[PDB]
Enzyme design. Structure first.
Site, PDB file in Angstrom:
ATOM      1  N   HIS A  79     -10.391  -5.258   4.839  1.00 53.05           N
ATOM      2  CA  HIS A  79     -10.414  -3.875   4.398  1.00 53.05           C
ATOM      3  C   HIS A  79      -9.311  -3.760   3.266  1.00 53.05           C
ATOM      4  O   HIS A  79      -8.027  -4.024   3.246  1.00 53.05           O
ATOM      5  CB  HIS A  79      -9.936  -2.826   5.298  1.00 53.05           C
ATOM      6  CG  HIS A  79     -10.356  -1.548   4.972  1.00 53.05           C
ATOM      7  ND1 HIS A  79     -11.788  -1.206   4.821  1.00 53.05           N
ATOM      8  CD2 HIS A  79      -9.659  -0.497   4.376  1.00 53.05           C
ATOM      9  CE1 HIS A  79     -11.865   0.069   4.195  1.00 53.05           C
ATOM     10  NE2 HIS A  79     -10.679   0.706   4.180  1.00 53.05           N
TER      11      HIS A  79
ATOM     12  N   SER B 113     -12.554   2.933   0.161  1.00 51.73           N
ATOM     13  CA  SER B 113     -12.308   3.656   1.518  1.00 51.73           C
ATOM     14  C   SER B 113     -12.403   4.979   1.487  1.00 51.73           C
ATOM     15  O   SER B 113     -13.638   5.443   1.085  1.00 51.73           O
ATOM     16  CB  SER B 113     -10.989   3.213   1.975  1.00 51.73           C
ATOM     17  OG  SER B 113     -10.630   3.410   3.293  1.00 51.73           O
TER      18      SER B 113
ATOM     19  N   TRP C 104       0.580  -1.092  -0.159  1.00 52.06           N
ATOM     20  CA  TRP C 104      -0.134   0.261   0.066  1.00 52.06           C
ATOM     21  C   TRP C 104       0.785   1.377   0.002  1.00 52.06           C
ATOM     22  O   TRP C 104       0.163   2.370  -0.282  1.00 52.06           O
ATOM     23  CB  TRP C 104      -1.026  -0.086   1.215  1.00 52.06           C
ATOM     24  CG  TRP C 104      -1.884  -1.198   1.071  1.00 52.06           C
ATOM     25  CD1 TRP C 104      -1.783  -2.175   2.171  1.00 52.06           C
ATOM     26  CD2 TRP C 104      -2.954  -1.517   0.374  1.00 52.06           C
ATOM     27  NE1 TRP C 104      -2.937  -3.113   1.718  1.00 52.06           N
ATOM     28  CE2 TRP C 104      -3.567  -2.693   0.741  1.00 52.06           C
ATOM     29  CE3 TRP C 104      -3.769  -0.806  -0.453  1.00 52.06           C
ATOM     30  CZ2 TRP C 104      -4.659  -3.271   0.175  1.00 52.06           C
ATOM     31  CZ3 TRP C 104      -4.804  -1.219  -1.183  1.00 52.06           C
ATOM     32  CH2 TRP C 104      -5.307  -2.539  -0.799  1.00 52.06           C
TER      33      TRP C 104
ATOM     34  N   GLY D 104      -6.709   5.648   1.367  1.00 54.39           N
ATOM     35  CA  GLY D 104      -5.626   5.900   2.272  1.00 54.39           C
ATOM     36  C   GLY D 104      -6.080   6.885   3.494  1.00 54.39           C
ATOM     37  O   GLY D 104      -5.311   7.648   3.811  1.00 54.39           O
ATOM     38  N   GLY D 105      -7.126   6.894   3.730  1.00 54.19           N
ATOM     39  CA  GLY D 105      -7.789   7.795   4.874  1.00 54.19           C
ATOM     40  C   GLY D 105      -7.636   9.258   4.771  1.00 54.19           C
ATOM     41  O   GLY D 105      -7.408   9.961   5.616  1.00 54.19           O
TER      42      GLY D 105
ATOM     43  N   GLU E 117     -13.949  -5.883   7.556  1.00 55.40           N
ATOM     44  CA  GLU E 117     -13.347  -4.431   7.379  1.00 55.40           C
ATOM     45  C   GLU E 117     -12.518  -3.806   8.490  1.00 55.40           C
ATOM     46  O   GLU E 117     -11.970  -3.167   8.291  1.00 55.40           O
ATOM     47  CB  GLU E 117     -14.735  -3.355   7.252  1.00 55.40           C
ATOM     48  CG  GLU E 117     -15.561  -3.838   5.975  1.00 55.40           C
ATOM     49  CD  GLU E 117     -14.871  -3.116   4.735  1.00 55.40           C
ATOM     50  OE1 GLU E 117     -13.646  -2.766   4.626  1.00 55.40           O
ATOM     51  OE2 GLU E 117     -15.581  -3.191   3.788  1.00 55.40           O
TER      52      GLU E 117
HETATM   53  C1  LIG Z   1      -2.437   4.961   9.041  1.00 59.44           C
HETATM   54  N1  LIG Z   1      -3.360   4.421   7.801  1.00 59.44           N
HETATM   55  C2  LIG Z   1      -3.703   2.951   7.889  1.00 59.44           C
HETATM   56  C3  LIG Z   1      -2.503   2.098   7.622  1.00 59.44           C
HETATM   57  C4  LIG Z   1      -1.503   2.563   6.623  1.00 59.44           C
HETATM   58  C5  LIG Z   1      -0.966   1.636   5.619  1.00 59.44           C
HETATM   59  N2  LIG Z   1      -1.830   0.269   6.102  1.00 59.44           N
HETATM   60  C6  LIG Z   1      -2.629  -0.271   4.617  1.00 59.44           C
HETATM   61  C7  LIG Z   1      -3.269  -1.431   5.011  1.00 59.44           C
HETATM   62  C8  LIG Z   1      -4.487  -1.360   4.402  1.00 59.44           C
HETATM   63  C9  LIG Z   1      -5.495  -2.515   4.460  1.00 59.44           C
HETATM   64  C10 LIG Z   1      -5.065  -3.370   5.424  1.00 59.44           C
HETATM   65  C11 LIG Z   1      -3.888  -3.332   6.044  1.00 59.44           C
HETATM   66  C12 LIG Z   1      -2.950  -2.506   5.756  1.00 59.44           C
HETATM   67  C13 LIG Z   1      -3.058   0.882   6.686  1.00 59.44           C
HETATM   68  S1  LIG Z   1      -3.946   5.745   6.697  1.00 59.44           S
HETATM   69  O1  LIG Z   1      -3.756   5.095   5.200  1.00 59.44           O
HETATM   70  O2  LIG Z   1      -3.267   6.840   7.118  1.00 59.44           O
HETATM   71  C14 LIG Z   1      -5.686   5.895   7.136  1.00 59.44           C
HETATM   72  C15 LIG Z   1      -6.152   6.558   8.166  1.00 59.44           C
HETATM   73  C16 LIG Z   1      -7.529   6.731   8.649  1.00 59.44           C
HETATM   74  C17 LIG Z   1      -8.510   5.860   8.035  1.00 59.44           C
HETATM   75  C18 LIG Z   1      -9.954   5.656   8.373  1.00 59.44           C
HETATM   76  C19 LIG Z   1     -10.857   4.810   7.761  1.00 59.44           C
HETATM   77  C20 LIG Z   1     -10.238   3.946   6.931  1.00 59.44           C
HETATM   78  C21 LIG Z   1      -8.993   3.785   6.597  1.00 59.44           C
HETATM   79  C22 LIG Z   1      -7.932   4.837   6.946  1.00 59.44           C
HETATM   80  C23 LIG Z   1      -6.621   4.742   6.779  1.00 59.44           C
END
Ligand SMILES: CN(C[C@@H]1CCN(Cc2ccccc2)C1)S(=O)(=O)c1ccc2ccccc2c1
Ligand SMILES: *[C@@H]1O[C@H](CO[C@@H]2O[C@@H](C)[C@@H](O)[C@@H](O)[C@@H]2O)[C@@H](O[C@@H]2O[C@H](CO)[C@@H](O[C@@H]3O[C@H](CO)[C@@H](O)[C@H](O[C@H]4O[C@H](CO)[C@@H](O)[C@H](O)[C@@H]4O)[C@@H]3O)[C@H](O)[C@H]2NC(C)=O)[C@H](O)[C@H]1NC(C)=O
Ligand SMILES: *[C@@H]1O[C@H](CO[C@@H]2O[C@@H](C)[C@@H](O)[C@@H](O)[C@@H]2O)[C@@H](O[C@@H]2O[C@H](CO)[C@@H](O)[C@H](O)[C@H]2NC(C)=O)[C@H](O)[C@H]1NC(C)=O
Ligand SMILES: *[C@@H]1O[C@H](CO[C@@H]2O[C@@H](C)[C@@H](O)[C@@H](O)[C@@H]2O)[C@@H](O[C@@H]2O[C@H](CO)[C@@H](O)[C@H](O)[C@H]2NC(C)=O)[C@H](O)[C@H]1NC(C)=O
Ligand SMILES: *[C@@H]1O[C@H](CO[C@@H]2O[C@@H](C)[C@@H](O)[C@@H](O)[C@@H]2O)[C@@H](O)[C@H](O)[C@H]1NC(C)=O
Ligand SMILES: CC(=O)N[C@H]1[C@H]([C@H](O)[C@H](O)CO)O[C@@](O)(C(=O)O)C[C@@H]1O
Ligand SMILES: *[C@@H]1O[C@H](CO)[C@@H](O)[C@H](O)[C@H]1NC(C)=O
Ligand SMILES: *[C@@H]1O[C@H](CO)[C@@H](O)[C@H](O)[C@H]1NC(C)=O
Ligand SMILES: [Cl-]
Ligand SMILES: [Cl-]
Length: 526
Positions: free
Chosen positions: A435, A195, A79, A113-114, A322
């Site tokens: 997710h 997302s 990611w 990516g939030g 999720e």
């Molecule tokens: C810190 N982050 C999460 C980590 C960053 C990289 N990993 C990728 C991964 C993706 C799927 C499964 C396992 C790992 C996950 S984020 O990307 O900044 C973020 C922030 C807020 C969010 C609120 C709602 C939904 C998604 C959100 C994402």
């Protein structure tokens, strides 16, 4: 193989896909780079150019903090950005079928990516499969993320908020004015995303300035009414201000702040984003969509509730687990490297991690609604409960609530429930159907036999790709040939949804009904 766009000629490259050809135009600029005094401002339109732009490699990714919790582990690192980070990152990509289609339906992807991370150049966003197999055109863009894309000094054009959304919007505009030259139909454009991408697509349904820039919308694991999706105008200011202090840019003149934040290396801005909030969580969206009065004119929950969006069809859905991804990013007793059996106490501590600013009564109420055990002896009761808590609250229930609310105004909605765990999934088994791990299937990655996907996964991707592309082309996500289960419309009464899996695809009713009544009626009052 040169296409003349409205700003100049662009050269593409030739891809061999499944004994056929796709033309990829990678990294076409769609805005002036938001550099210097353009930082934080809305995206400015691109000056013309006389040369042949060489759109033959993915462009720079937007500045962002990188997940470094699992260094060297593909399940996290798949990611992370796979191109140079830069502020000069407003670029987009186009896969068109070979030979050049006549009036092809266009699919526009917005990554998640939030609102802090992400990039169009990721391998699981490769659009060449969809171009080759369904003869649609795939467009994807980079948009600014984190503070650089969502810093909000409301009303102040130097930092108006929502820049990343306006980046996306400007890309959609590019497709409207230029995709005809690539053989695409500007009148047949389906936004899809996952997302925060999906929350973005849902916000484009509300933003009047987007209503004429696309036709249909697909929402994967996300929607604007999700609790993480929209920053309050209050918190955006508290966040902008706390950033100013951390960088030493605290000024009385609000524009003098922005000016000061414009002489900071992006590294200084990113390193401070984390503690801009007081108590962060694995889901913290430090800088995100805000009610700017421009892209967004009112709080979206009000707009949704009163039918104030683009009338059109939506394809909405969520994955079965999720919430599990976030449990290994802070929750006590959790790890991707063991089965994560946690105790009651550990479950209670995890609520404090995921609901920090919530009252004890609120946290007990989550505990009560999710620990009416069908079996007390079951040792992963708490582990599964905490995962479901996060998923139901953050994704499944707001996505379901969005679909009721939107369909109540007479539009066809289709709701899916992805419950297949990828055979190549690198996270452990207990994390389930995580997710983000429907995206490879939507993009037809199991269609390449040269990988290690099973035959059953190839068939499932093949059907999903057909259903997605038929939804884009015709507003109806059926597969009409291989005797497939008909995907019924989601109505507010019956609330029918389609399960997606390699086994049997079923029509089911009223997903997570008891869970979501708690999250959507009781819990917002706490
Ligand atoms: C810190 N982050 C999460 C980590 C960053 C990289 N990993 C990728 C991964 C993706 C799927 C499964 C396992 C790992 C996950 S984020 O990307 O900044 C973020 C922030 C807020 C969010 C609120 C709602 C939904 C998604 C959100 C994402
Ligand atoms: C954008 O992309 C084009 C095309 O690149 C090619 O696309 C495909 C067709 C494929 O073949 C790919 O492998 C390839 O990337 C780029 O075009 C190249 O342009 C450069 C110059 O900018 C050429 O290099 C020059 O070729 C001359 C041939 O006559 C040669 O004489 C040159 O030598 C230099 O030095 C002498 C000494 O005095 C001087 O007299 C010459 O006039 C010259 O300056 C030099 O080798 C490449 O050959 C072109 N590519 C091909 C395959 O021919 C384009 O540069 C690129 N632009 C950007 C900005 O990326
Ligand atoms: C609004 O922001 C204030 C101040 O933010 C603090 O300072 C920043 C530079 C950064 O380091 C943040 O993480 C800090 O929180 C918040 O006030 C702080 O609150 C915590 C507990 O909530 C307290 O222990 C600190 O002493 C407070 N610091 C100050 C200077 O007041 C405030 O809570 C924020 N408001 C909301 C609603 O979140
Ligand atoms: C599952 O592992 C977690 C994480 O602990 C770390 O990672 C492991 C895979 C292993 O390499 C350990 O040496 C590491 O400590 C365990 O959580 C820890 O549990 C211990 C004892 O219960 C506690 O002292 C620590 O505070 C915990 N740390 C964290 C970050 O939660 C957990 O106990 C393991 N669970 C099972 C069922 O094995
Ligand atoms: C449909 O199935 C194709 C092959 O499966 C077999 O052939 C079809 C034509 C049916 O007549 C039946 O005999 C079998 O299902 C696949 O090659 C094709 O990709 C499938 N299409 C979709 C959209 O999934
Ligand atoms: C480094 C590591 O975790 N290795 C383990 C892998 C998976 O990657 C994890 O379950 C998720 O990380 O799965 C096993 O169960 C397996 O099926 O052989 C054990 C193996 O040691
Ligand atoms: C493309 O399709 C639209 C209808 O969707 C039609 O009005 C238009 O004339 C077509 N143009 C071309 C060049 O095919
Ligand atoms: C802040 O400085 C800018 C600099 O151009 C000026 O236009 C603005 O009026 C100032 N605002 C206040 C409140 O002093
Ligand atoms: Cl118990
Ligand atoms: Cl209830």
């Amino acid at each position: 193989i040169i296409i003349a766009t409205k700003n100049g000629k662009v050269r593409g490259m030739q891809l061999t896909v499944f004994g056929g050809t796709v033309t990829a135009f990678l990294g076409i600029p769609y805005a002036q780079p938001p550099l210097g005094r353009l930082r934080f401002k809305k995206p400015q339109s691109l000056t013309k150019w006389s040369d042949i732009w060489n759109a033959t490699k993915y462009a720079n990714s937007c500045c962002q903090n990188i997940d470094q919790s699992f260094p060297g582990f593909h399940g996290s690192e798949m990611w992370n950005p796979n191109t140079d980070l830069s502020e000069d990152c407003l670029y987009l990509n186009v896969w068109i079928p070979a030979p050049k289609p006549k009036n092809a339906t266009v699919l526009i992807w917005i990554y998640g990516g939030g609102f802090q991370t992400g990039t169009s150049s990721l391998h699981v966003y490769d659009g060449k499969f969809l171009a080759r197999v369904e003869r649609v055109i795939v467009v994807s863009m980079n948009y600014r993320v984190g503070a650089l894309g969502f810093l909000a000094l409301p009303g102040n054009p130097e930092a108006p908020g929502n820049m990343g959304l306006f980046d996306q919007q400007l890309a959609l505009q590019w497709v409207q004015k230029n995709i005809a030259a690539f053989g695409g139909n500007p009148k047949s454009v389906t936004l899809f995303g996952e997302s925060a991408g999906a929350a973005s697509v849902s916000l484009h349904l509300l933003s009047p300035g987007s209503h004429s820039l696309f036709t249909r919308a697909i929402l994967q694991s996300g929607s604007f009414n999700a609790p993480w999706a929209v920053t309050s105008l209050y918190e955006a200011r508290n966040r902008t201000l706390n950033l100013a202090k951390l960088t030493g840019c605290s000024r009385e003149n609000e524009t003098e702040i922005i000016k000061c934040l414009r002489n900071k290396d992006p590294q200084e801005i990113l390193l401070n984003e984390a503690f801009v909030v007081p108590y962060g969580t694995p889901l913290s969206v430090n800088f995100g969509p805000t009610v700017d009065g421009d892209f967004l004119t009112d709080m979206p929950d009000i707009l949704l509730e009163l039918g104030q969006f683009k009338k059109t069809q939506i394809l909405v859905g969520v994955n079965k687990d999720e919430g599990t991804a976030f449990l290994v990013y802070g929750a006590p007793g959790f790890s991707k490297d063991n089965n994560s059996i946690i105790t009651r106490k550990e479950f209670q501590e995890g609520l404090k991690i995921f609901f920090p600013g919530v009252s004890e009564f609120g946290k007990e109420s989550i505990l009560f609604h999710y620990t009416d055990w069908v079996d007390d002896q079951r040792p992963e009761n708490y582990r599964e409960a905490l995962g479901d808590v996060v998923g139901d609250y953050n994704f499944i229930c707001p996505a379901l609530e969005f679909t009721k609310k939107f369909s109540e105004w007479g539009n066809n909605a289709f709701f899916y429930y992805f419950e297949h765990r990828s055979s190549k999934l690198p996270w452990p088994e207990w994390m389930g159907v995580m997710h983000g791990y429907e995206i490879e299937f939507v993009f037809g990655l199991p269609l390449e036999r040269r990988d290690q996907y099973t035959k059953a996964e190839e068939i499932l991707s093949r059907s999903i790709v057909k259903r997605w592309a038929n939804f884009a082309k015709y507003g109806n996500p059926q597969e009409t040939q291989n005797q497939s289960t008909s995907w019924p419309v989601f109505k507010s009464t019956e609330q029918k949804y389609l399960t997606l899996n390699t086994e049997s695809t079923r029509i089911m009713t009223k997903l997570r009904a008891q869970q979501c009544r708690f999250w959507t009626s009781f819990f917002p009052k706490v």
